[PDB]
Amino acid sequence: KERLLDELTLEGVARYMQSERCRRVICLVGAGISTSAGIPDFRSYDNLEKYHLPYPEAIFEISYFKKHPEPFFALAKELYPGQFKPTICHYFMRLLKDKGLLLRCYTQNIDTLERIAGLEQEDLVEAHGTFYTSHCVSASCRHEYPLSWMKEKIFSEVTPKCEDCQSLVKPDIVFFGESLPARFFSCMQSDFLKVDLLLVMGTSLQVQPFASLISKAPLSTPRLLINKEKAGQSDPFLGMIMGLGGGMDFDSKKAYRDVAWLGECDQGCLALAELLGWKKELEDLVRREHASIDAQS
């Protein structure tokens, strides 16, 4: 449609971010933006070997969870909010919020580091759920359990059983085979009508239907990929139908709006901030926030 970047580079994106058109930015973030916090990317020493799974992917599958929930809860104790501090990438999105640029952040992560970084719930679409709320597995029951109730069991190595029907209690985390929250679909419908820039950070786009989000962007909307490798160049598979289009296009002769920056997210965001002139503001924000987190202890 229209080319808005004068150059397909990080410098070209930065220069565009300072233009008058760049009003609304949407972020798609994956596991790569939390690795530098200490949270390993399980999709890429084996962190899962200790659980003796039939296969590493099983720990995130709903059918395996309902029979063998122990490995997940052991991992959940590690992933729990408070065990980690947000990264530079997280606080970069905080800067987007405070400057009024952040329309929405869609996240594949379940570490809630976005929330801790200062992003409010309205700013957030947690595509794969949250640990803040838990429900009973029984459809006849479906009793809701608070965060503190859930937190006590997980840190005490006790599988959370229901207090009514004695069934299993799982955090509202979206496992494979489970349906995504309603917010995801209602937000994706309206958010991508008015987005000026797509920031895809720390994801190889390996999980659906999250990966399909990139096809919802308008044809002229620039899309920047900050990831350890190139991704999203294949069929987005929107609606589980092929041929609809929307795949990333960095290297072809037809490329016009897709920019790939290869490396770690922290360095990617630092580089982008340096170009934008937010370098000092970003560094201060991180150190100040981390100090405030340690102040709670």
Binding site: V174, F176, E178, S179, Q206, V207, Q208, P209, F237, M240
Partner: peptide
């Protein structure tokens, strides 16, 4: 095919 709303991997099948 009918499970778009379901969390999946990037396979072009069900």
């Amino acid at each position: 095919y009918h499970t778009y709303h379901v969390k999946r991997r990037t396979n072009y099948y069900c």
